[PDB]
Amino acid sequence: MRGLSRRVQAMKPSATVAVNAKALELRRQGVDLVALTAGEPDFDTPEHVKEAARRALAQGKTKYAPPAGIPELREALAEKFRRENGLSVTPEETIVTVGGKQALFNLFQAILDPGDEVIVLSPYWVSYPEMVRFAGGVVVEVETLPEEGFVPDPERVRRAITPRTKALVVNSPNNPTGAVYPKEVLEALARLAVEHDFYLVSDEIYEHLLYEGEHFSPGRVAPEHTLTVNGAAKAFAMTGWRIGYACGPKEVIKAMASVSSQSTTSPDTIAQWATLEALTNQEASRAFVEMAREAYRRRRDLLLEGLTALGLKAVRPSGAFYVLMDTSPIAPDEVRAAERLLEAGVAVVPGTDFAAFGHVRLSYATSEENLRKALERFARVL
């Protein structure tokens, strides 16, 4: 017989991706709207990275790369995790994937048997629950509170652990909250994984878009229980290049490259060499990162001051480029609230699927002009 599988029938395709398409299609309709839905830098990818790509193209580096990635990138990855994060990985405990998303997807497909539980901290990124269930696992949510700055309380987390717990997913800096969890809290979560024997999956793609505090890698504390996921996407404005990377226990990494060989073979060879440049050319990349960070910081402060002045509540973010705004003043719920905003000319992502009810997610990864323009419309809505 014909027909789709149950797993695909159960799955929700990316909600953030979906709302972006809608806001983009509305502008084609000539509709004047300010989109605050983007989850990607407005800056183009730095020139040094583009040159590395042109150089690869010219050198004929267009053939298949190994499932785990070109050796050269793996060595630079080992160096980056070591130098920037304190992790003691070897190139063999490193892997390159089609974006950080495929690092996570291949991760779950490699460690989840049907029924295995995965603890997810809410508000969580739209994709965690979907990937966990597509692999057959069960999502166990542990709540994070705004009054606690959206930082996890390791005690609420311990109370959600069961004999079925296979993994715990931490994301700092956080999407959609923008929170940066303290070293102490991360060490605590890392200890729970060691004590109870399960995997800590640390999603660090926003590590460089930090404005206050410091970035701590739990993998320093629990090295054989931790899988660190990262990527070139946010740090270098390389979202469309599709290059992510991860490190951790050699056996899990080796399992992940196996899934890669039977699905995508390996990521784009040109994009791989381009990324090698972003990582090794420290002077040039550090320069881009410093420049983008200060621009985002400047946009964060601008946005937050405006919300405060309009009497809209929002926990002050310390990383990433998102803000969860309490929509109570606008409507009784995020869906109706997001509808009103769209009608006022501003597109936001409702917090429904992030489990951030009563809130809406804003992105300050656009021009100051757009931010100011959005703030005016918020005003009239109120």
Ligand X SMILES: Cc1ncc(COP(=O)(O)O)c(CN)c1O
Least distance (Å) between residue 232 CB and ligand X:
7
Q: Which two tokens stand for residue 283?
A: 């002077």
Nearest CA among 84, 218, 248 for reference residue 257: 248
Judged by CB, which is closer to a second copy: 164, or 372? 164
Regarding 265 and contact with ligand X (CB under 6 A), the answer is yes
Furthest CA-CA distance within the chain: 60
Regarding 346 and contact with a second copy (CB under 8 A), the answer is no
Regarding 208 and contact with ligand X (CB under 6 A), the answer is no
Among ligand X, a second copy, none, what binds residue 367 when CB lies within 5 to 8 Å by partner kind? none
158 annotated to bind ligand = no
Please choose, out of 94-102, 132-140, 253-261, 302-310, the segment that lies near ligand X by the rule CB under 6 A: 94-102
Work out which of 92, 251, 301, 305 binds a second copy, going by CB under 8 A: 251
Regarding 14 and contact with ligand X (CB under 6 A), the answer is no
Q: How far apart are CA 179 and CA 93, in angstroms?
A: 28
Least distance (Å) between residue 109 CB and ligand X:
16
Regarding 11 and contact with a second copy (CB under 8 A), the answer is yes
Regarding 199 and contact with a second copy (CB under 8 A), the answer is yes
30 annotated to bind ligand = no
Regarding 304 and contact with a second copy (CB under 8 A), the answer is no
Q: Are 353 and 311 in contact (CB under 8 A)?
A: no
Q: Which two tokens stand for residue 272?
A: 């791989």
Regarding 74 and contact with a second copy (CB under 8 A), the answer is no
Among a second copy, ligand X, none, what binds residue 105 when CB lies within 5 to 8 Å by partner kind? a second copy
175 annotated to bind ligand = yes
- The CA distances from residue 170 to 115, 153, 185, 205, 211, in Å, are 20, 12, 11, 12, 19
Give the number of other CB atoms < 10 A from CB of residue 1. 2
**Residues 121-140 close enough to bind a second copy by CB under 8 A:** 127, 130-131, 134-135
380 annotated to bind ligand = no
Measured in residues, the chain has a length of 382
Regarding 21 and contact with a second copy (CB under 8 A), the answer is yes
Work out which of 32, 63, 147, 311 binds a second copy, going by CB under 8 A: 63
**Residues 155-184 close enough to bind ligand X by CB under 6 A:** 171, 175
- DSSP for 369-380, written as a single string: HHHHHHHHHHHH
Strand (E) positions, the chain? 34-35, 94-97, 117-122, 138-143, 165-171, 199-203, 226-231, 244-247, 322-326, 346-347, 349-350, 359-363
Among a second copy, ligand X, none, what binds residue 19 when CB lies within 5 to 8 Å by partner kind? none
Among a second copy, ligand X, none, what binds residue 296 when CB lies within 5 to 8 Å by partner kind? none
| Number of continuous H segments (helices) and E segments (strands) in the chain | 13, 12
Least distance (Å) between residue 379 CB and a second copy:
30
- Cα-based angle 225, 230, 232 (whole degrees, multiple of 5): 165
- DSSP for 251-282, written as a single string: HHHHHHHHHHHTTTSSS-HHHHHHHHHHHH-H
Least distance (Å) between residue 87 CB and ligand X:
18
Nearest CA among 357, 360, 361, 291 for reference residue 322: 361
Q: Which two tokens stand for residue 277?
A: 């440049």
Regarding 124 and contact with ligand X (CB under 6 A), the answer is no
Regarding 334 and contact with ligand X (CB under 6 A), the answer is no
Regarding 231 and contact with ligand X (CB under 6 A), the answer is yes
Regarding 28 and contact with a second copy (CB under 8 A), the answer is no
Q: Summarize the annotated binding site for L-aspartate as residue ranges.
A: 39, 125, 175, 361
The residues of the shown chain that bind ligand X, judged by CB under 6 A, are: 39, 99-101, 125, 171, 175, 203, 205, 231, 233, 239, 244, 265
